[PDB]
A = this chain, B = another copy of it.
Amino acid sequence: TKIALIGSGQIGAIVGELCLLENLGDLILYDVVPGIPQGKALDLKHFSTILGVNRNILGTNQIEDIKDADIIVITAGVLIGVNGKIMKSVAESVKLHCSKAFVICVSNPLDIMVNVFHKFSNLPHEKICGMAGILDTSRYCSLIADKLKVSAEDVNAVILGGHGDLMVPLQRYTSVNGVPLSEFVKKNMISQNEIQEIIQKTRNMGAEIIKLAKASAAFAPAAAITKMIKSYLYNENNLFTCAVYLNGHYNCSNLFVGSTAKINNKGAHPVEFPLTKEEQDLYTESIASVQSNTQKAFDLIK
C-alpha cells in the first residue's frame, strides 16, 4: 500500500506521521517547492526509527512518483481562483499516473475543490471525497460532552452540509452512548440556548483557531483524514459526514456536498436519512450555495 500526500505542508506531514503510527502504508510526500518534502521525509524516517515503524518514506518533487498510489490526500494550495487551478493540475496528474486511487481532498474551499477535482479527474465519483464533516462533528461533539460532563468517546452526531456557515446540525441525530440529546434537555442537564451557543461555536471554530494560533488547524484535520484512509483500506464501512457525490439523495444529484456516507473498499457512498421539511429546507439552501460557488469556480478557472 502506497499513500501519496499531494502537498507536504502542515496537514500533509501530520497525515504521514499518523499513517506511520498506525502502519497504514508506505508514504510518498510530494510538493512543488524543492527540498521541503525531502527534508520532512527524512524527519519522518528518524521519527519512524525511534518508534519502531519500518514503512518506506520518499520525499519527491516529481509527480510521476505518484504511480500506482492506492491513497491520495490533496492539501496542495494556499482562495477559489488559485487553488482551483492547482486542483485541476493534480486532477490531471492523478488520471494518467494513479487512476485507481481513492482520493481525499482537503484544499479550501473544500466542497468547491472536491467538485473541481471530479470534473477534471475523470475518476469514478465513489473514489473521490473531501474531509469536512468529521471536523465539524468532532468540535460539536466535544462541546456537548464538556457541558454534559461526559467523555466525548460516545457522543455521536450528524452534521450535514458544507464546512462553514452553511452547516446543518441535526439535534435529532445527536446521542450520548445511544441516549438522544433530547433526553438531556429533558433532565435539565442542557438547555436549547446552550446547544445553539455550541452550534455557533462549531461554526466559528476554524476562525477562532486562526485568530488565536495565527494558523489554521492541523492536528484534528489530519486525524479526520487518517480515519477516512483507515476506513477505506480496512474495508470498515464506518459512517462519516464527508464531501460525497449525491445521486438523488437529499433531493440533489450531480454534486459533491457535505453529507452522510459510508467509506469502504469501493469508496465513499452517500447515505440518505429521513429529514423534516425544515431539515431538508436548510440543507437544500446549503446545497444551493455549493452549486453556485462551484460553477463560478469552474468559470473563474477560465
Give chain A's interface residues, CB within 8 Å of chain B: 13-14, 17, 21-23, 35-36, 38-40, 42-52, 54-56, 134-135, 138-139, 141-142, 145, 149-154, 156-158, 170, 172-180, 183, 186-187, 205, 208-215, 217-220, 222-224, 227, 231, 234-240, 260, 262, 272-274
Q: Are B138 and A224 in contact (CB under 8 A)?
A: no
In the complex, the answer to whether A54 meets B234 with C-beta atoms within 8 Å is yes
Q: With the chains together, A175 CA to B178 CA distance in Å?
A: 5
Which one of B212, B215, B223, B260 contacts A38 once the chains associate, using CB atoms below 8 Å? B212
Candidates B13, B50, B134, B149; contact of A138 at CB < 8 Å = B50
Quick one: which of B35, B142, B187 contacts A273, CB cutoff 8 A?
B187
> Nearest chain-B residue to A183 (Cβ)?
B273
Whether B44 and A219, one on each chain, are in contact in the complex, defined by CB atoms closer than 8 angstroms, is: yes
Q: Which chain B residues lie closer than 8 Å to A234 at the CB level?
A: 23, 54-55
B39/A227 in contact, CB under 8 A:
no
Bound Cα distance from A223 to B172, whole angstroms = 31
Interface pair B36/A213, CB less than 8 Å apart: yes
Additional 7 contacts, C-beta under 8 A, given A52-B152, A151-B236: A40-B213, A43-B217, A43-B218, A44-B220, A46-B205, A46-B217, A50-B224
State which of B44, B139, B239 has its C-beta within 8 Å of the C-beta of A46: B139
Smallest beta-carbon distance A50→chain B, Å: 4
Nearest B-chain residue to A142, judged by Cβ: B49
Q: Are B35 and A214 in contact (CB under 8 A)?
A: yes
**Which chain B positions have C-beta within 8 A of A236?**
54, 151, 153
Our pick among B157, B178, B208, B239 for the contact of A158 (Cβ within 8 Å) is: B178
* Chain B residue contacts of A51, Cβ below 8 A: 223, 227
Docked complex Cα distance between A138 and B172 (Å): 24
- What 3 pairs between A and B have smallest CB-CB spacing? A39-B213, A39-B212, A156-B178
Query: Would A215 and B149 count as touching, CB distance under 8 A?
Result: no
A50 and B220 within 8 A (CB): yes
Asked if A179 contacts B158 (CB within 8 A), the reply is yes
Q: Which of B151, B209, B231, B238 contacts A43 (CB 8 A)?
A: B209
Q: Do B43 and A219 touch (CB < 8 A)?
A: yes
Indicate if the CB atoms of B178 and A174 lie closer than 8 Å. yes
Contact (Cβ within 8 A) B150 A239: yes
Chain B residues with CB below 8 A from A138, complex form: 46-47, 49-50
Q: List 21 A-B contacts (CB under 8 A).
A: A23-B234, A35-B213, A36-B213, A36-B214, A39-B214, A42-B208, A42-B209, A43-B218, A45-B142, A46-B135, A46-B205, A47-B219, A47-B223, A49-B141, A49-B152, A52-B152, A54-B151, A150-B262, A151-B237, A157-B177, A173-B177
